[PDB]
Structure 1
């Protein structure tokens, strides 16, 4: 598979999200670029419908793992780029402890020269003055490692991991992610050995932006697969 060859330079990114959480509807559009050689993403997200009714951090994981940096001696475990350009479907349920849950379905694929992430999100059973609908989460994102396993019986990968959102009162809101990815096209895809992605995020604001928005810098790097015997 020559999908990896599509990520050797800097690749423009488009993210479009339609959301509906407890009947609060919203849209987000993001634009930026990805640099898979460094595992680097830089995007600016706009809530195009006005006010985002959930905290920006709760959408970070939903708003392009094909840009993770896989070390050379792990390239054969990079499912995400192998599925390109025909792309993959990314599906999650994100269960917020003692609160509601998101269900997401995304298509990540190339459209022209641009990597596009198109997401449908439905949120259900949230408390209107909980941490999510009540906007009680701090504007940041803790670094986290997410374990990846192959899903042979689906030709894809799966992953479950916990995100820990800092609450404004010092407590922590748990967001349990269950994720599954499957290719869109029928080409050959890499089924990795078990490994993890290591992720860091920096969230900020654009001074000259009055719209509700999030400026995001993200690094994703693959790890967890051992070495030792490499002399070609």
Structure 2
């Protein structure tokens, strides 16, 4: 337990949200590899299912503890463990839709388990758009810039996202995040990138709306010397 963390951990999730007036609760459980930047999780809609919107919008809402950091970049996220960190993000879609999500990440060292409590709110998705019509097909892999705010001991993230559409199109979404360790650290990173790759597969049956999500994320510095 480097920071209360081990090589392979279990994860528990609860999300409450509201999108275009529709309320929901999702729970989840998963397995992850903090130092590899890999996680796989299983989500289950527990109230308000079946959702009237693409599962895909919730993907980036379901933990930067799961990022592979080179030893030469300060790992702000693992350093915040076990107590953890919280994050706030706005999603600005190019069609005017707007989301906000807040999460709180925390470790139980005794259970070797990461807990994740989030709130997801979305307004203004066009009723006829690919989100509300569930015609999306995963996010394209990305490169997020992580920026230190040194007077405050917090980080900003900035990633321009593309949700691939079943019909061959792409829907742009701007992510702006604020990452806050529960204790503001004296050790801060310089700006760096984190690259991400998601997969998402619906596994819904007659009882429940269910799906499987994975992320692979790797932090790095500029490629220019």
**Same fold (TM > 0.5):** yes
User: Please, what is the CA RMSD of the aligned residues?
Assistant: 2.2
Summarize deviations over 1:43-93 as a string: whole Å, max 9, x none: 11111122122211111111111111112233xx21111111111111000
> Residue 79 of structure 1 corresponds to which residue in structure 2?
76
Structure with the largest fraction of strand = 2
Instruction: Tell me if the contact between 1:40 and 1:217 (Cα under 8 Å) persists in the aligned partners.
Output: yes
CA shift, 1:173, in A, is 0.6
**Distance in 2 separating the partners of 1:148 and 1:209:** 41
SS of aligned partner of 2:96: coil
Q: TM-score, normalised by structure 2?
A: 0.90
* Deviation, structure 1 residue 193: 0.7
1:19-168 mapped onto 2 (5 Å cutoff) = 19-49=17-47, 50-74=49-73, 77-111=74-108, 113=111, 114-138=113-137, 140-168=138-166
Taking the TM superposition and a 5 Å limit, the aligned residue runs for 1:174-193 are 174-184=172-182, 186=183, 188=185, 190-193=187-190
Q: Secondary structure at the match of 2:190?
A: coil
Structure with greater proportional helix content: 1
Distance 1:187 1:153, change over 3 A: closer
1:160 and 1:145 mapped to 2: Cα distance? 9
Over 3 Å counting, the alpha-carbon distance change for 1:188 and 1:209 in structure 2 is farther
Tell me how far apart the structure 2 counterparts of residues 120 and 189 of structure 1 sit (CA, whole Å): 29
Aligned partner of 2:9 in structure 1 is 11
For 1:153 and 1:25, the matched residues in 2 are separated by 38
Q: Deviations over 1:173-227 (max 9, x none)?
A: 111101001122x363532111111111222244878521221221111112579
Structure 1 unaligned runs (5+)?
none
Distance 1:208 1:224, change over 3 A: same
1:88·1:108 contact (CA, 8 Å) conserved in 2? Answer: yes
When normalised by structure 1's length, the TM-score is 0.87
Long gaps (5+) in structure 2: none
